[PDB]
């Protein structure tokens, strides 16, 4: 009867691999002066190896996982070569006549020890990565035999007390049919990989490695949360059928709108990622995004030290469109100028950037910007489902002037023998109280809306998103912002269009029932929030939420509206 | 058959005074070197007189009109003593060997001449005041006889081709039964005085002074726009009866609420002045204000180099309350922190002051400020009708916390044996889209609303009131702001309260029919706008305006809403 936390559901059958590591012996024997010069050379000679061996691991991470994991090694390597460590490690040996393995341990342990004093779980984990660098350094000076998880010639299950980020890079994903460890829990780096990799694995076993020997045959239920050791065929069979169900579950979920973004009583919404860069598509796919709800194109502009031309934009958009496969991306035209300047533009300062010459106000005062970009988006739409959406819309005037612009850019493309999706849908950010107010009018003029609650909150409450001194007044969960949200959604629906939401409220656990009840069609968020919200959605009853929403919309006070939400959560799941 | 522009309606009977002035002779005869030293002394000796005589006129203006007219003389005197004039006047005489009256004329004429090159009517008038200083200087060096309007021992009518601001100060208001001149028109300084003084007078006669001799008996109709010269008693009689009607008109208008702020079809609104300082009460009374709709207390705070204590505030408020007589003042608690900092507070900088720690957000983070002030207002309410109004309100939370505050401060006063109007009404600025959105909720909690459209526009459109680069987007006449205005007014009325407006829209000729049609109860503006708006109000039909308003509120476009307004003005007066 062994149970863990189960990080990924599924089933698997294979041999068990056990990572055994010998304890590192440290000699506290003081060294003589003649040994001072020799110990430094041993450290440099031992450090010389890890230098080249660490570099080899980096290259495997880049090809195996990508640049996201390749740079983490550079930080560890760059930190190791820090000139502060060279002087501090040598000084103790030269000054205290200590050994290199004992003196070096104090330096890396000293810094990591300072990090543990921190009262944050996020800073403590990084201290674990730093500690790992010094831990291996001691083995490197001694020249301890390394197992290396890359030397696997046969498929096996991976069992260990805990895995350090360094092992996950040089790990064979195809030869490992799963991962099992007794680490702390999801807060473990390897645990997150099981989720994104979508492979069965446990991390809270507690003491399975002490019960398993290498070459042991084990079957992972990852469904009943049980492990069978050398079990007959009656269990190897049950499991095999459990694995069948698992596979059918995929096959069914595989359907289009038949996704978890459905309440108990059958109400579906989209749930998507906001992104900045192709690189974010990875997190989106990892977290179960059904498409991209907001492609903040600014971020691509701050990914460069020059304004990206039509061609550079096109390429960037094309990549995204393609890295998204079948999925739709809502490409927002550029929003520079509140707290998001791009320095390379050298725009002049403003007294209130957030009430200033922002986003569309620029692209309309400098058509080359609007034109290059819209041109690029359109052209990229020849390569995947894209939508166009505009930021900082304030009037019907603005929308018509920009549609007219699209139509001009569309013809030019037609005339230059350049495909673009003629179906391409156009919408607007509703993130201004103006837009919210004339939502009915705007809804005739666009295909859709996405409510930017970060901004909407900001202007409706006149509280600067940046200003910590008044942060306590920044409440997107005000009777004032909610009402304006409702009013927008309703506008959508009255024209037979839809409203999504890319403001942070979409991703906020506390609004999910209200957003849902109020009929929001689409949620778009940081990818990392997709599962929390999906979970809430999948476990609500939609009808109940409507009732909730309605109540909340009548409250003159946030507190009073928080109460409704809470009594709901109490009574309803 | 002589007709002028009539600046003030009324009737008068009295003798005619004629201001005759001899032409100033200028000698272009070059002076010798021995005469250079003597001419400078003559200028200094002649300048010595005007120095003391100009100072005497200043003291008469202060006692006669007040500090508003006393400082204008200091500028003229300070400009005359400018060290640049001393060196430039002496240099030409010493360098060009010119005469003091001819050389001095070039210096003052030279600067005034540069001002005329300006293409602005407002800058040109000031050039007239500077020209006057040099014109009299020539008489002062020559020692020309001065008539002085203060030497009047008998009541007479004042007739002149044109009067310079200097004469208006040393003018006997009680001995002058009216003012008649052939100047340009209302753009004449003296013409404005007839309006504020409320005395019959003409400024566009054209050539009456050439037809009148001093000691002539004239009757001013100022009603039929005619002047009778030595007319029998049949006309001295008609006029006397015309004067009776005039007096009855006052008596009727005198009433109270039934004033000019009434549409043709009987709909009344209040029309008041926004003020900053007791000193503004004068302009308000001058321009026919029926009370004060917004007393921006910040302005009193920027009228000082220290934070005004409870006692200083009280005094300041008391004065206002009293300078307003029977009239109600809406005292807004302090609004510092957008474009209105007070430097003496040394508050820290903000990234977006207008979305920052503004107004009520301060007084709530520093109770001493809120307390002193509310204390002071309450106590001042023992001395005249005052209301309390709060700026930058965003939530029902804020209002309740502040009412609760009032109630505490009320008791303290009760306990310290300090009267305050127990009837004192409390309201809120609706100048946030939040407030506008929860207007229904807020309306239960306050006695009234005043819509701040400067701010409301700002946040609804996210356009900084300060930012000229996007000024073209600052449109309080958007379908978005108007709708929010309507929604607020309606909230008021639904609770049986009222909404006023102190934003600049109230004073904007183009909104007046809409504001009216939408049922706005109260308008408050710069005093100078009171008559334009009153005029529009008095000449509208209210029912028609409703229809107008309604139409305008359905337009998705400003232009389209401007069209309605225009076709109205065409067809309707």
CSV table of C-alpha atoms in Angstrom, one decimal, chain A residues 263-516:
chain,number,residue,atom,x,y,z
A,263,UNK,CA,-18.5,23.2,-16.9
A,264,UNK,CA,-20.2,20.1,-15.4
A,265,UNK,CA,-23.5,21.2,-17.1
A,266,UNK,CA,-22.0,21.5,-20.6
A,267,UNK,CA,-21.0,25.2,-21.1
A,268,UNK,CA,-17.8,25.6,-23.0
A,269,UNK,CA,-15.3,28.5,-23.2
A,270,UNK,CA,-12.0,29.0,-24.8
A,271,UNK,CA,-9.0,29.2,-22.6
A,272,UNK,CA,-5.8,30.4,-24.3
A,273,UNK,CA,-2.4,31.8,-23.6
A,274,UNK,CA,-1.4,35.4,-23.9
A,275,UNK,CA,2.1,35.3,-25.5
A,276,UNK,CA,5.0,37.6,-26.3
A,277,UNK,CA,7.2,35.5,-28.6
A,278,UNK,CA,7.2,32.1,-30.4
A,279,UNK,CA,9.1,31.0,-27.3
A,280,UNK,CA,5.9,31.3,-25.3
A,281,UNK,CA,4.1,28.8,-27.5
A,282,UNK,CA,6.0,26.1,-25.7
A,283,UNK,CA,4.5,27.1,-22.3
A,284,UNK,CA,1.1,27.4,-24.0
A,285,UNK,CA,1.1,23.9,-25.4
A,286,UNK,CA,2.6,22.7,-22.1
A,287,UNK,CA,-0.3,24.1,-20.1
A,288,UNK,CA,-3.1,23.0,-22.4
A,289,UNK,CA,-3.9,26.3,-24.1
A,290,UNK,CA,-6.5,25.9,-26.9
A,291,UNK,CA,-5.0,28.8,-28.9
A,292,UNK,CA,-3.5,32.2,-28.3
A,293,UNK,CA,-5.8,34.9,-27.1
A,294,UNK,CA,-3.4,37.8,-27.2
A,295,UNK,CA,-0.1,38.1,-29.0
A,296,UNK,CA,1.4,41.2,-27.5
A,297,UNK,CA,3.4,42.3,-30.5
A,298,UNK,CA,5.3,45.0,-28.5
A,299,UNK,CA,7.1,42.2,-26.8
A,300,UNK,CA,8.5,41.1,-30.2
A,301,UNK,CA,9.6,44.7,-30.6
A,302,UNK,CA,11.5,44.6,-27.3
A,303,UNK,CA,13.0,41.3,-28.4
A,304,UNK,CA,15.2,43.4,-30.8
A,305,UNK,CA,17.4,46.6,-30.9
A,306,UNK,CA,15.7,48.1,-34.0
A,307,UNK,CA,12.2,48.5,-35.2
A,308,UNK,CA,11.2,45.3,-37.0
A,309,UNK,CA,10.4,45.9,-40.7
A,310,UNK,CA,7.5,44.5,-42.5
A,311,UNK,CA,9.6,41.5,-43.4
A,312,UNK,CA,11.0,40.8,-39.9
A,313,UNK,CA,7.5,41.1,-38.5
A,314,UNK,CA,6.1,38.9,-41.2
A,315,UNK,CA,8.7,36.2,-40.3
A,316,UNK,CA,8.1,36.5,-36.6
A,317,UNK,CA,4.3,36.2,-37.2
A,318,UNK,CA,4.7,33.3,-39.6
A,319,UNK,CA,6.8,31.4,-37.1
A,320,UNK,CA,4.2,32.0,-34.4
A,321,UNK,CA,1.3,31.0,-36.7
A,322,UNK,CA,3.2,27.9,-37.5
A,323,UNK,CA,4.4,27.1,-34.0
A,324,UNK,CA,0.7,27.2,-33.2
A,325,UNK,CA,-0.3,24.5,-35.7
A,326,UNK,CA,-4.0,24.3,-36.1
A,327,UNK,CA,-4.6,26.9,-33.4
A,328,UNK,CA,-5.7,30.5,-33.8
A,329,UNK,CA,-3.5,33.4,-32.7
A,330,UNK,CA,-5.0,36.8,-31.9
A,331,UNK,CA,-2.3,39.1,-33.0
A,332,UNK,CA,-2.7,42.5,-31.3
A,333,UNK,CA,-1.2,45.4,-33.1
A,334,UNK,CA,1.5,47.1,-31.2
A,335,UNK,CA,1.0,48.7,-27.8
A,336,UNK,CA,3.9,50.9,-26.9
A,337,UNK,CA,3.8,53.8,-24.6
A,338,UNK,CA,2.5,53.4,-21.1
A,339,UNK,CA,4.9,51.5,-18.9
A,340,UNK,CA,6.1,49.8,-22.1
A,341,UNK,CA,8.4,52.1,-24.0
A,342,UNK,CA,10.9,50.8,-26.5
A,343,UNK,CA,14.0,52.8,-25.8
A,344,UNK,CA,15.2,52.5,-29.4
A,345,UNK,CA,12.3,54.7,-30.5
A,346,UNK,CA,13.6,57.6,-28.4
A,347,UNK,CA,10.1,58.9,-28.0
A,348,UNK,CA,9.8,62.0,-25.8
A,349,UNK,CA,8.8,61.8,-22.2
A,350,UNK,CA,5.2,62.3,-21.1
A,351,UNK,CA,3.7,63.5,-17.9
A,352,UNK,CA,1.3,60.5,-17.8
A,353,UNK,CA,2.5,57.8,-20.2
A,354,UNK,CA,-0.6,55.7,-19.4
A,355,UNK,CA,-2.8,58.5,-20.5
A,356,UNK,CA,-0.5,59.5,-23.3
A,357,UNK,CA,0.6,58.7,-26.8
A,358,UNK,CA,0.1,55.0,-26.6
A,359,UNK,CA,-0.4,52.0,-29.0
A,360,UNK,CA,-2.8,53.0,-31.7
A,361,UNK,CA,-2.2,56.6,-31.2
A,362,UNK,CA,1.3,56.1,-32.5
A,363,UNK,CA,0.6,53.9,-35.4
A,364,UNK,CA,-2.0,56.4,-36.5
A,365,UNK,CA,0.5,59.3,-36.2
A,366,UNK,CA,3.1,57.3,-38.1
A,367,UNK,CA,1.5,55.2,-40.7
A,368,UNK,CA,4.7,53.4,-41.8
A,369,UNK,CA,4.3,51.6,-38.4
A,370,UNK,CA,0.7,50.7,-38.7
A,371,UNK,CA,1.2,49.8,-42.3
A,372,UNK,CA,4.3,47.6,-42.0
A,373,UNK,CA,2.7,45.8,-39.2
A,374,UNK,CA,-0.8,45.2,-40.6
A,375,UNK,CA,0.8,44.3,-43.9
A,376,UNK,CA,3.0,41.7,-42.1
A,377,UNK,CA,0.1,40.3,-40.1
A,378,UNK,CA,-2.1,39.9,-43.2
A,379,UNK,CA,0.7,38.3,-45.1
A,380,UNK,CA,1.4,35.9,-42.2
A,381,UNK,CA,-2.3,34.9,-42.2
A,382,UNK,CA,-1.5,33.0,-45.3
A,383,UNK,CA,0.2,30.6,-43.0
A,384,UNK,CA,-2.1,29.8,-40.1
A,385,UNK,CA,-5.3,31.1,-38.5
A,386,UNK,CA,-4.6,34.6,-37.3
A,387,UNK,CA,-6.9,37.3,-36.0
A,388,UNK,CA,-6.1,41.1,-35.8
A,389,UNK,CA,-6.9,43.0,-32.8
A,390,UNK,CA,-6.3,46.7,-31.9
A,391,UNK,CA,-5.2,48.1,-28.5
A,392,UNK,CA,-6.3,51.3,-26.7
A,393,UNK,CA,-9.5,51.8,-28.8
A,394,UNK,CA,-11.5,54.7,-27.5
A,395,UNK,CA,-14.0,55.6,-30.2
A,396,UNK,CA,-15.9,54.3,-33.2
A,397,UNK,CA,-14.0,56.9,-35.2
A,398,UNK,CA,-10.7,55.1,-34.4
A,399,UNK,CA,-12.0,51.6,-35.5
A,400,UNK,CA,-13.4,52.8,-38.8
A,401,UNK,CA,-10.2,54.7,-39.6
A,402,UNK,CA,-8.2,51.5,-39.0
A,403,UNK,CA,-10.5,49.1,-40.9
A,404,UNK,CA,-10.2,51.5,-43.8
A,405,UNK,CA,-6.5,51.2,-43.4
A,406,UNK,CA,-6.7,47.4,-43.4
A,407,UNK,CA,-8.8,47.5,-46.6
A,408,UNK,CA,-6.1,49.6,-48.2
A,409,UNK,CA,-3.3,47.3,-47.1
A,410,UNK,CA,-5.4,44.4,-48.2
A,411,UNK,CA,-5.6,45.7,-51.8
A,412,UNK,CA,-1.9,46.4,-52.0
A,413,UNK,CA,-1.2,42.8,-51.0
A,414,UNK,CA,-3.7,41.6,-53.7
A,415,UNK,CA,-1.9,43.8,-56.2
A,416,UNK,CA,1.6,42.6,-55.3
A,417,UNK,CA,0.5,38.9,-55.7
A,418,UNK,CA,0.7,38.2,-52.0
A,419,UNK,CA,-1.8,35.8,-50.3
A,420,UNK,CA,-3.6,36.7,-47.1
A,421,UNK,CA,-6.5,35.0,-45.4
A,422,UNK,CA,-9.5,36.9,-46.9
A,423,UNK,CA,-11.5,35.6,-43.9
A,424,UNK,CA,-9.3,37.4,-41.5
A,425,UNK,CA,-11.2,38.5,-38.5
A,426,UNK,CA,-10.7,41.9,-36.9
A,427,UNK,CA,-11.6,42.9,-33.3
A,428,UNK,CA,-10.7,45.4,-30.7
A,429,UNK,CA,-9.3,45.5,-27.2
A,430,UNK,CA,-12.0,46.8,-24.9
A,431,UNK,CA,-9.7,48.2,-22.2
A,432,UNK,CA,-10.8,51.7,-22.1
A,433,UNK,CA,-14.0,52.9,-20.2
A,434,UNK,CA,-14.8,54.7,-23.4
A,435,UNK,CA,-14.8,51.5,-25.4
A,436,UNK,CA,-16.8,49.8,-22.7
A,437,UNK,CA,-19.4,52.5,-22.8
A,438,UNK,CA,-19.9,52.4,-26.6
A,439,UNK,CA,-19.4,48.7,-26.7
A,440,UNK,CA,-22.8,48.4,-28.5
A,441,UNK,CA,-21.6,50.7,-31.3
A,442,UNK,CA,-18.2,49.1,-31.5
A,443,UNK,CA,-19.7,45.6,-31.7
A,444,UNK,CA,-21.3,46.3,-35.1
A,445,UNK,CA,-17.9,47.3,-36.4
A,446,UNK,CA,-15.7,44.4,-35.3
A,447,UNK,CA,-15.8,40.6,-35.2
A,448,UNK,CA,-14.9,40.3,-31.6
A,449,UNK,CA,-13.7,41.9,-28.3
A,450,UNK,CA,-11.1,41.1,-25.8
A,451,UNK,CA,-11.4,43.0,-22.5
A,452,UNK,CA,-8.2,44.3,-21.2
A,453,UNK,CA,-8.9,44.5,-17.5
A,454,UNK,CA,-5.5,45.7,-16.6
A,455,UNK,CA,-6.1,48.9,-18.5
A,456,UNK,CA,-9.8,49.0,-17.9
A,457,UNK,CA,-9.3,48.7,-14.2
A,458,UNK,CA,-6.6,51.4,-14.5
A,459,UNK,CA,-8.8,54.0,-16.2
A,460,UNK,CA,-12.1,53.1,-14.6
A,461,UNK,CA,-10.5,53.5,-11.1
A,462,UNK,CA,-7.8,56.0,-12.2
A,463,UNK,CA,-5.2,53.9,-10.5
A,464,UNK,CA,-1.9,53.4,-12.1
A,465,UNK,CA,-1.0,49.8,-12.6
A,466,UNK,CA,2.5,50.7,-11.7
A,467,UNK,CA,1.8,52.6,-8.5
A,468,UNK,CA,2.3,50.5,-5.3
A,469,UNK,CA,1.4,53.4,-3.0
A,470,UNK,CA,-2.2,53.1,-4.2
A,471,UNK,CA,-2.2,49.5,-5.2
A,472,UNK,CA,-4.9,48.7,-2.6
A,473,UNK,CA,-7.3,50.7,-4.8
A,474,UNK,CA,-6.5,48.8,-8.0
A,475,UNK,CA,-9.5,46.5,-8.0
A,476,UNK,CA,-10.6,44.8,-11.2
A,477,UNK,CA,-13.1,43.2,-8.9
A,478,UNK,CA,-15.1,46.2,-8.3
A,479,UNK,CA,-18.7,46.6,-8.9
A,480,UNK,CA,-17.5,49.2,-11.3
A,481,UNK,CA,-15.2,47.1,-13.5
A,482,UNK,CA,-17.5,44.1,-13.4
A,483,UNK,CA,-20.5,46.0,-14.6
A,484,UNK,CA,-18.4,47.4,-17.5
A,485,UNK,CA,-17.3,43.8,-18.2
A,486,UNK,CA,-20.9,42.6,-18.4
A,487,UNK,CA,-21.9,45.5,-20.5
A,488,UNK,CA,-19.2,44.6,-23.0
A,489,UNK,CA,-19.9,40.9,-23.1
A,490,UNK,CA,-23.6,41.7,-23.6
A,491,UNK,CA,-22.7,44.1,-26.5
A,492,UNK,CA,-20.8,41.2,-28.2
A,493,UNK,CA,-23.6,38.8,-27.8
A,494,UNK,CA,-26.2,41.2,-28.9
A,495,UNK,CA,-24.4,41.4,-32.3
A,496,UNK,CA,-23.8,37.7,-32.3
A,497,UNK,CA,-20.1,38.2,-31.7
A,498,UNK,CA,-18.1,37.1,-28.7
A,499,UNK,CA,-15.9,38.6,-26.1
A,500,UNK,CA,-12.7,37.2,-24.8
A,501,UNK,CA,-10.5,38.5,-22.0
A,502,UNK,CA,-6.7,38.8,-21.9
A,503,UNK,CA,-6.5,41.0,-18.9
A,504,UNK,CA,-5.2,39.3,-15.8
A,505,UNK,CA,-8.7,38.8,-14.4
A,506,UNK,CA,-9.2,35.9,-16.9
A,507,UNK,CA,-6.4,34.2,-15.1
A,508,UNK,CA,-7.5,35.2,-11.6
A,509,UNK,CA,-9.0,32.2,-9.6
A,510,UNK,CA,-11.4,34.6,-8.0
A,511,UNK,CA,-13.1,35.9,-11.0
A,512,UNK,CA,-13.4,32.7,-12.9
A,513,UNK,CA,-17.0,31.9,-11.7
A,514,UNK,CA,-18.1,35.5,-12.4
A,515,UNK,CA,-16.4,35.8,-15.7
A,516,UNK,CA,-18.0,32.5,-16.6
